[PDB]
RNA sequence: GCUCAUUCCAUCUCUUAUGUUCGCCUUAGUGCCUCAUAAACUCCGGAAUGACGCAGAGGGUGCUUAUCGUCCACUGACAGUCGCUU
């Protein structure tokens, strides 16, 4: 079952005559009635497309929760809210419509729009996928609306840290690459040389060097900042390249900071030191 | 620390000069009165930080024997400098009556190009030879230097063989989603504007340059001879390139030498 | 004279404000510390002309009270007019990047974004003494200065003068309304015999037009529609703004709903130089 | 610059017939005049711009292609420590 929800004028039309090819678009039901609607859709036996606005919002999301409450196991429900900012949304609105809730409560164009957010709101938390339409046009918005409701693979997209060496070429997986040369090199230390990458001392001159506190927070502000576009998209193992020439003492320690950071995120990361690898 | 100082006529484009003090770190203040300038480097001092000033006719004192007595006055951990700038008089009329109120002024400027540690003739100028200029004139010069080399590859094709940094750009709007848009390639105007819209693209833009930004100075260090940064799209026609040519284009600004590379493009 | 203070959320189109200012002759100062800003007014008090400074999170202090005792220095009693701009944040951005240098506050500040959220709060201490609040979210590069050229040619001593008059048709209208609106489809009490000479000021009239609820419905909604023109009588540049309403005579209706109306934004706290001209002449 | 459809500033003014009912008069007068059905013109205290020419005045036009979006993993390179030898 595809719920799509937001405020008016984010596009929800364009997204039901997509969702009816992707799909059963039906608009406009107090939801209290769709239950028995998808009890009537199983013998359908087909996906389904419902789409809830100010107008189709009862103003009590208890009766929201509790149409979720009996939903019939067959579809599973997920939430997919458009959303896009204020001038825009006036913007396109302005196509022939008449926003209802502004009938007889007369908020200026801004104001309800301001009035419907939070109403709508309680659902907005609870909202599963999100997708902005802050400036894709009703024709630019279409393609979009295509390449990411197709969502085969709605399981997760793992983390996968690859540490790496340069004098045997980047690895062909690599997403993104991160030299991490300029960093101190342990080398200097005859005694660390021969100690390879996982073992402590070496952890201990980097941990003795703030230079690398300051990489490694900053790349984590680098990536988290542009990860969840990617996370929506449908990929499948989404990979970071780490390397210094030698592969076995920086980009070790590089990779598996990173990796303890973002597992504590709970995105499941998994280590690949290449080099080390046997083979 | 610096208390660099500006001068020349007008339309030589010292605004440029202070741009490019203030991308190096030094604070500006524009077109403060002459007077103020000892106080105000005491506040600096209080900074702990570099800076410079500007100097216009209206800040140009009636007795410049006050101007050189408070440029006494100054501290002396903050080292002035005098830059004074020449080009042609149409040569100015381009960037800008028109004769002998330059004349006049000049008269009230010349005891400053006296005064000049630096003269430049900006004639034939430009920002980068500004922004060059200035690297050696203040930061000193090192025969260790860069070179940034921007490539924009396909992910189909493969990642380039020589590769530093590099940055998968499939996240960004695709121009791909307009028709009207698939055949042309990433430097028609078309889908440059296309971009330049979608804020996310400005977004990264910007995010990105500062993650380099950050970076780039020890890189410096070493002597390093190259630097290559490589972004990538699916195909390499529309955002990578749009991406690559953007963001060379900043770094140019700073200074930096820079040399773009349209890989995909390039094959044919 | 004048002393302009232009400041606005980062990268507002400040800068092009001060070109505008400098274009206009106000002596230009750019980035100027806080401090000796007073003993920069004493300075120019010789040049005997207006001037411009600007004051955005790059001269901006921590401490608030900072720059509330330096406008407290201020001498000559120089009127300190402020100018304030502002516009959205994802506009902000898209205007931010000019290959200009970072938000300083990128003192490990996570994104352009952020900063430049935090920035409105920072800089929150000024919105108080706000002359003009103008936004510039819709101008252009080049385009939001034409604007900006339109703006502060002015006089503020031409306060809003908000008036209302109730005319009848049966003459004309007044030439100068700018804004009109017919009511006569309101109810019209002359089933009332003794209220069609009854002049409609009397309570009575009055009484028998509040006897009807579809007057009180219409004239909420007309005070509301008129509140959303804030923006429009910002903009003046006029001595005195004029509201057009007229009944077929006059004196029949308009006069008590302008009356209200005159009661609604007298409440507001409006100039009401009010005259329902048309009426006894 | 010259001179002008322009721009944004200019202080600037009136009407016939429609039927009707109530406020009032002429004493019929078809009215003085409230309500009320439609039809009907103008006009100078600022600051920008385009319109020619002053003044510079040395390739174009139409339509035939562009297949390149997502997604999934074989992977490469002759130019100090020591683990060594004969």
Redesign the pocket.
Known sequence: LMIVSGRSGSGKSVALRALEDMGYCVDNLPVVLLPDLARTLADREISAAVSIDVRNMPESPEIFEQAMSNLPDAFSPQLLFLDADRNTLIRRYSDTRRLHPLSSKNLSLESAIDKESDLLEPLRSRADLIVDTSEMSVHELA?MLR?RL?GKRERELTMVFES?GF???????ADYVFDVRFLPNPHWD?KL??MTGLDKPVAAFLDRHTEVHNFIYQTRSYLELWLPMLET??????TVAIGCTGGKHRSVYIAEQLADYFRSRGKNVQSRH?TLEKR
């Open positions: 393609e390449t197709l790496f004098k045997h070429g980047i690895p062909i997986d005859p040389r021969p998209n449908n990929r499948s193992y989404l290449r």
